[PDB]
Amino acid sequence: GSMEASCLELALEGERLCKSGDCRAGVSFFEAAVQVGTEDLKTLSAIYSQLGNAYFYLHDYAKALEYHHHDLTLARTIGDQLGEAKASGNLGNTLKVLGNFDEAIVCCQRHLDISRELNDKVGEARALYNLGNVYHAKGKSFGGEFPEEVRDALQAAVDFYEENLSLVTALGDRAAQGRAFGNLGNTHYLLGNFRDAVIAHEQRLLIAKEFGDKAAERRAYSNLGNAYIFLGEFETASEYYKKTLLLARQLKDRAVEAQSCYSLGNTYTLLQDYEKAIDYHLKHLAIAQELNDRIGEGRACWSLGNAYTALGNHDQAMHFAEKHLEISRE
């Protein structure tokens, strides 16, 4: 019946609620537990870290940063190096999302270095994935014709992801491999290594199927299609977007489905088919407005007016722009 005992109890309920996917409730329990307090700084460290992650998942990145900062500091106070490595990785990930890449890199690098010192291979691998992510976001945030420092950041990302894959292969960690393959493929895409991107997304697709992860499967098909566009193989691309459209309906994901239809219309145009294009753009706007999607609504129109203006229908084209200008002004 100490203060220590109630803090623990509140925290356990916090952890339970968060695992169940109710982060909003869990946050309050962790805040209650902080309110009650405890003299065990190890317990308190774990509560801060869970608050940081809970806020991160709720997209309150500014709060996530605050709590991961407290956790890092407290980890240093008590000399818990494993705890320090974890907090720094968490901090770097939050910094990355906020667009503070320079400090993000320093924090994620501290997570890697300490994992190495401790001979913690699981942690080392996670830190490498985190580092690939930061260098990727860093290179992508700028603005084939890239400044040297941008190409260098993207190529470091490739190296981190490949180093990660080598360790998680040794560890037998399939979900970790799925994550790395996907982001590696995206990094190759940005570098214009389109063949390598396909290879990476193919591996990512295979793992998505293994897990029965229909959403990851859907991402992979979509990324594969994008890469085939830039390889010229427009036919194969439409075939992958068709796969995503099928999946979009199974998942009952309205927006994703809008995306799938929009892409196919754009691909047929590169194939010089304008009817199919129109039918897909039609579905997109139909689903767009259905989601309170103003930006999307207009996009379809400029597309549609270009497609009718290619068909030879110079009236329905010249029409289409009119509803676009309306949403434009709105």
Binding site: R126, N130, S222
Partner: peptide, 18 residues
């Protein structure tokens, strides 16, 4: 847009070490 995989985060629990 290319669609990214999720970030991982490192986790701690109060049940660690007892």
């Amino acid at each position: 847009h290319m669609e990214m995989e999720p970030e991982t985060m490192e986790t701690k629990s109060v049940t660690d070490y007892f």
